[PDB]
Enzyme design. Structure first.
Site, PDB file in Angstrom:
ATOM      1  N   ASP A 114      34.181  31.022  33.887  1.00 31.72           N
ATOM      2  CA  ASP A 114      33.037  31.639  34.549  1.00 31.72           C
ATOM      3  C   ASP A 114      32.152  31.842  32.794  1.00 31.72           C
ATOM      4  O   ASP A 114      32.928  32.303  32.053  1.00 31.72           O
ATOM      5  CB  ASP A 114      34.143  32.974  34.612  1.00 31.72           C
ATOM      6  CG  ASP A 114      34.319  32.678  36.603  1.00 31.72           C
ATOM      7  OD1 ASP A 114      33.549  32.361  37.568  1.00 31.72           O
ATOM      8  OD2 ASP A 114      35.709  32.111  36.572  1.00 31.72           O
ATOM      9  N   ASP A 167      39.899  34.668  39.065  1.00 32.43           N
ATOM     10  CA  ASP A 167      40.975  35.531  38.608  1.00 32.43           C
ATOM     11  C   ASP A 167      41.440  36.551  39.643  1.00 32.43           C
ATOM     12  O   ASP A 167      41.854  37.664  40.200  1.00 32.43           O
ATOM     13  CB  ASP A 167      40.202  36.889  37.886  1.00 32.43           C
ATOM     14  CG  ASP A 167      39.101  37.446  38.242  1.00 32.43           C
ATOM     15  OD1 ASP A 167      37.905  36.732  38.544  1.00 32.43           O
ATOM     16  OD2 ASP A 167      39.348  38.483  38.115  1.00 32.43           O
ATOM     17  N   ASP A 212      38.801  33.636  44.803  1.00 35.20           N
ATOM     18  CA  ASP A 212      38.992  31.945  44.362  1.00 35.20           C
ATOM     19  C   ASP A 212      39.684  31.405  44.294  1.00 35.20           C
ATOM     20  O   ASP A 212      39.697  30.348  43.819  1.00 35.20           O
ATOM     21  CB  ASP A 212      38.998  32.902  42.074  1.00 35.20           C
ATOM     22  CG  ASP A 212      37.815  33.424  42.042  1.00 35.20           C
ATOM     23  OD1 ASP A 212      36.500  33.462  42.495  1.00 35.20           O
ATOM     24  OD2 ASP A 212      37.286  34.066  41.015  1.00 35.20           O
TER      25      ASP A 212
END
Ligand SMILES: C/C=C(/C)C(=O)O[C@H]1C(C)=C2[C@H]([C@@H]1OC(=O)CCCCCCC)[C@@](C)(OC(C)=O)C[C@H](OC(=O)CCC)[C@@]1(O)[C@H]2OC(=O)[C@@]1(C)O
Ligand code: NA
Length: 999
Positions: A356, A708, A712
């Site tokens: 990310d 996180d 996910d």
């Protein structure tokens, strides 16, 4: 769609929900409907984990192939320790007890891990509360029952602090507003506003389901009533649980090779047993009368146990664990929390990293850098006033610059209105921390950068140098708040990509004319609704050339080397009447934000980490592809990739960057093809992180993935290396293999380099311990093929493979890493540990070791002063001494059981393995190029191993157990005479490998 329970509850109106289940909102479900709905859909809970019993767990410790052989060898040793003639049982049941003790100690460790292991699926049960408030027909008031008894169609009640028990379609919001903490799903802890109006998309994502209460989320503020849509594994949090249970994680390459090793090792052992039986076929030509078949059979079962013990590297699983755990503590200091020991190898073979952008590639420290308003509009002529703001912190320190010149923001009527928008159309603020000493943010990072901006601009020249430090945080903001009175705020929504606030002037008690609306949102969406353009204080109609000039600068700022996120700021000079505005309908917000007047555009920067620049470069040198997953638009995402080094500054990336929408429109064929070349994904759909992993795994890529949130978790578990943030949810952590304690992308690369350096040292001691098991088996085969007395017993071999060789092997884990670790492509997972010319080297060493030990014992029986004058022809027929005495007349037949020859053989095996440990400092480099003192730990370990060898040679209880005796100085010379040249043998094989195979 025809699965179970309420399908698209968010797209159905409140009436269609109550009519679907046939439940009244005032009364609720009848006790008959409770039984019926509980029988059909089940209980509202995630299914219990498989209670792996202790007995089933202990049995799993005896399912490996090698531990089965040792167990079988333990049984033969136990039998042979019983059916025997003698009176010395203090050294009889010793051997089977040791094998059992190792097996027991081995089983103890496996249970100690499973008791302390915790899967991520059981971590999801942290987000399901115990009680829940429902309204049913058997009572009047609200009653709290267990959340597992709640069924779809129930009328549930939730309030602030409560944890949402099930997926709930909101019926009626009793309070003013309803805020929900959906932080456990995504990553933003920013509470979202809910409504009761339906969402017209049946296939809308959870972020847009603004009329739903997701099971596991927390009510931030308010109180609402709702009807239960789904329960159990049908909830959004339960649909994630089923994806994690269905994900299968393969064994690490080292684990797959070790399992492969035991397979072939088990085959060779039996094959050797066949070969030994084929060499002694001649016993068929021996008379049935005479000889001891009872003694001939023990001999074949005695060498069998010795053959098994000589094959199994019983110390290897402990050295791997020791090396891994010591390397894990090492990575911990480099901010890399490795949660699974075997992952360290997998981390080294990483070929693709999907990270990310925000918080990992960048610092998530927003800061407004540029801003521009309209200078004047005179037909086709068009000019802008572009400014620049200094200071990258949230602190209100800095000044505004026009053409690198400090200007007063209060001298521009456009900047005055610019600041008014940023301060009022904002739900965030500042707070000077006295514990830390810095200015911290309160809310989102984007809106706080606007709060810092109005403090630096100071369009009213308020005396801020006289105020204190804590009052300096919200100085100019408070001045603007006293002006306009915020009536209400139109919340942000992804459909129109903007938010607004209704404001009325302060001094206005008997008036209805003067209200204003301040709109802030995405540039394209806001500018299209603008029919006017503010110029200082005046206003002119929005034309074509002027509108293109605005968008072009927004394009240059977001796609250029600045990589800025642009926010358009506009005002509605004639807002609709207060009564003609419905505040419950979020679909009419874009309607209320029409007929705007463009004011200006601010450009903020999310700066990348100072270490990301070079860390991307290492991955290029290490052959590791880096993929960015961000929420910036495709143009900005590409521009940011060019900035941090993922994309070249001028290379084509039309086929190397896709948005979530673009990726879905591709068929599955071009999707898998897109993943092998893409390095940039923008506006990623929730289900796309797992899809990217699967496509990456179809090309056999060892993929690392970052996350996180519980959203996910299925992608983290599916990826080879799930990488969770230290600031992430505990579920994302338990679903990941590694945790970034600092959320820095560079920590990933530093852990991959460390993961490579550990395995290269792991190659050595794995190849070193097995090389010893090779030569040991040769010794057992020679003494069996030639008919010689046993040179080495299982008790001694276990001491060698656990203690004597364990200390050097562990020290080989501290070998210095090479200087070109990250200058080589990632290791192939199929790459075998020993093959080719290396196979032949250990083939020659093992043949040499097996001869040196068998010879050292046979040397004492023959050519030794302490030993007898026995010759070769009778040493091979030693079992006929007690019967056929005239053939072997001379000395006692008990001399064929003397400890001296076994000690010579054992001392030779020990000395060689100390030398062979030095040969294991480098695969092909000589000891003249890489001296032995390169690894001080290895030298110390070798000193300790020898000191432990003399320990079992003198401390009286020990040499009776291991059946040893202190060697003479002359006999120790013969040990070195036959052990030392093992270095020259391998050194020659190294020279050959360097000059006639390196091409
Ligand atoms: C320990 C004792 C030896 C005898 C043994 O059984 O190991 C073999 C076997 C299992 C392999 C071989 C051994 O094969 C032999 O040494 C041939 C023996 C024939 C002698 C008879 C002549 C009278 C390894 C040991 O050979 C030597 C020459 O180095 C190398 C390697 O091992 C590794 O790379 C270690 C992986 C953990 C493996 O080929 C391995 O099989 C594959 O799965 C691997 C990849 O394991
Ligand atoms: Na995983």
């Amino acid at each position: 769609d025809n699965a179970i329970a309420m399908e698209a509850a968010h797209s159905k109106s409140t009436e269609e929900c109550l009519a679907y289940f046939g439940v009244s909102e005032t009364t609720g479900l009848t006790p008959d409907q409770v039984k019926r709905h509980l029988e059909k859909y089940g209980h509202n809970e995630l299914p219990a984990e498989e209670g792996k019993s202790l007995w089933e767990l202990v049995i799993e410790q005896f399912e490996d192939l090698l531990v089965r052989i040792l167990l079988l060898a333990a049984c033969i040793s136990f039998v042979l320790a019983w059916f025997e003639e003698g009176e010395e049982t203090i050294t009889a049941f010793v051997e089977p007890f040791v094998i059992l003790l190792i097996l027991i100690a081995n089983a103890i460790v496996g249970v100690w891990q499973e008791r302390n292991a915790e899967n991520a699926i059981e971590a999801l049960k942290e987000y399901e509360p115990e009680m829940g408030k429902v309204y049913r027909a058997d009572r009047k008031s609200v009653q709290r029952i267990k959340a597992r008894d709640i069924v779809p169609g129930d009328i549930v009640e939730v309030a602030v602090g409560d944890k949402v028990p099930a997926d709930i379609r909101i019926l009626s919001i009793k309070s003013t507003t309803l805020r929900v903490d959906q932080s456990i799903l995504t990553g933003e802890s920013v509470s979202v506003i809910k409504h009761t109006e339906p969402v017209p998309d049946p296939r809308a994502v959870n972020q847009d389901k603004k009329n739903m209460l997701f099971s596991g989320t927390n009510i931030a503020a308010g109180k609402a009533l709702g009807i239960v849509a789904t329960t159990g594994v049908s909830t959004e949090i339960g649909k994630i649980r089923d994806q994690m249970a269905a994900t299968e994680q393969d064994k690490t390459p080292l684990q797959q090779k070790l399992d492969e090793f035991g397979e072939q090792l088990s085959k060779v052992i039996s094959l050797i047993c066949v070969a030994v039986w084929l060499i002694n076929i001649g016993h068929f030509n021996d008379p049935v009368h005479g000889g001891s078949w009872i003694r001939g059979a023990i001999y074949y079962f005695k060498i069998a146990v010795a053959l098994a013990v000589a094959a199994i590297p019983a110390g290897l699983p402990a050295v791997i664990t020791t090396c891994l755990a010591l390397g894990t503590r090492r990575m911990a200091k480099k901010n890399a929390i490795v949660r699974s020991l075997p992952s360290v190898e997998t981390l080294g073979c990483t070929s693709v990293i999907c990270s990310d952008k925000t918080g990992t590639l960048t610092t998530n420290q927003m800061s407004v850098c540029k801003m521009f308003i309209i200078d004047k509009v005179d037909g086709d002529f068009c000019s802008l006033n572009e400014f620049s703001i200094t200071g990258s912190t949230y602190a209100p320190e800095g000044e505004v610059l026009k053409n690198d010149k400090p200007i007063r923001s209060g001298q521009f009527d456009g900047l005055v209105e610019l600041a008014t928008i940023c301060a009022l159309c904002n739900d965030s603020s500042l707070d000077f921390n006295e514990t830390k000493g810095v200015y911290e943010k309160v809310g989102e990072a984007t809106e706080t950068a606007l709060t810092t901006l109005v403090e630096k601009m100071n369009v009213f020249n308020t005396e801020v140098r006289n105020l204190s430090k804590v009052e300096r945080a919200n100085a100019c903001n408070s001045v603007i708040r006293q002006l306009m009175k915020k009536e209400f705020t139109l919340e942000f929504s992804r459909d129109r990509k903007s938010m607004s606030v209704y404001c009325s002037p302060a001094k206005s008690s008997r008036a209805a004319v003067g209200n204003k609306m301040f709109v802030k949102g995405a540039p394209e969406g806001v500018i299209d609704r603008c029919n006017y353009v503010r110029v200082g204080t005046t206003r002119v109609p929005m034309t074509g050339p002027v509108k293109e000039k605005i968008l072009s600068v927004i394009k240059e700022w977001g796609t250029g080397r600045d990589t800025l996120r642009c926010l358009a700021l506009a005002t509605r000079d004639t807002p609709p009447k207060r009564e003609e505005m419905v505040l419950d309908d979020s679909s009419r917000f874009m309607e209320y934000e029409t007929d705007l007047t463009f004011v200006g555009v601010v450009g903020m920067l999310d700066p990348p980490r100072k270490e990301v620049m070079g860390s991307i470069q290492l991955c290029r040198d290490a052959g590791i592809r880096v993929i960015m997953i961000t929420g910036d638009n495709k143009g900005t995402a590409i521009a940011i990739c060019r900035r941090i080094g993922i994309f070249g500054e001028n290379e084509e990336v039309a086929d190397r960057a896709y948005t979530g929408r673009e990726f879905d429109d591709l068929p599955l064929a071009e999707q898998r093809e897109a993943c092998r070349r893409a390095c940039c994904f923008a506006r990623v759909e929730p289900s796309h992180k797992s899809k990217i992993v699967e496509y990456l795994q179809s090309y056999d890529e060892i993929t690392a993935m970052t996350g996180d949130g519980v959203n996910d978790a299925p992608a983290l578990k599916k990826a080879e290396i799930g990488i969770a943030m230290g600031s992430g949810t505990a579920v994302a952590k338990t679903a990941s293999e590694m945790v970034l304690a600092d959320d820095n992308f560079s920590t990933i690369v530093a852990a991959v380099e460390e993961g490579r350096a550990i395995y290269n040292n792991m190659k050595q001691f794995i190849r070193y311990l097995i090389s010893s098991n090779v030569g040991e088996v040769v010794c057992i085969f020679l003494t069996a093929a030639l008919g010689l007395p046993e040179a080495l017993i299982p008790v001694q071999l276990l001491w060698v493979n656990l203690v004597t060789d364990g200390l050097p092997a562990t020290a080989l884990g501290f070998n210095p890493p090479d200087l070109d670790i990250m200058d080589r492509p990632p290791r192939s997972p199929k790459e075998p540990l020993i093959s080719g010319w290396l196979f032949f080297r250990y083939m020659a060493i093992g043949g040499y070791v097996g001869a040196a030990t068998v010879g050292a014992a046979a040397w004492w029986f023959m050519y030794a002063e302490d030993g007898p004058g026995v010759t070769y022809h009778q040493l091979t027929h030693f079992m006929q001494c007690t019967e056929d005495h005239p053939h072997f007349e001379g000395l006692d037949c008990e001399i064929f059981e003397a400890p001296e020859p076994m000690t010579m053989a054992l001392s030779v095996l020990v000395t060689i393995e100390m030398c062979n440990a030095l040969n294991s400092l480098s695969e092909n480099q000589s000891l003249m190029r890489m001296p032995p003192w390169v690894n001080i730990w290895l030298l110390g370990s070798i000193c300790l191993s020898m000191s432990l060898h003399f320990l079992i040679l003198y401390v009286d209880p020990l040499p009776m157990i291991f059946k040893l005796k202190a060697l003479d100085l002359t006999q120790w010379l013969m040990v070195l005479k036959i052990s030392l040249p093992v270095i020259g043998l391998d050194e020659i094989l190294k020279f050959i490998a360097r000059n006639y195979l390196e091409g």
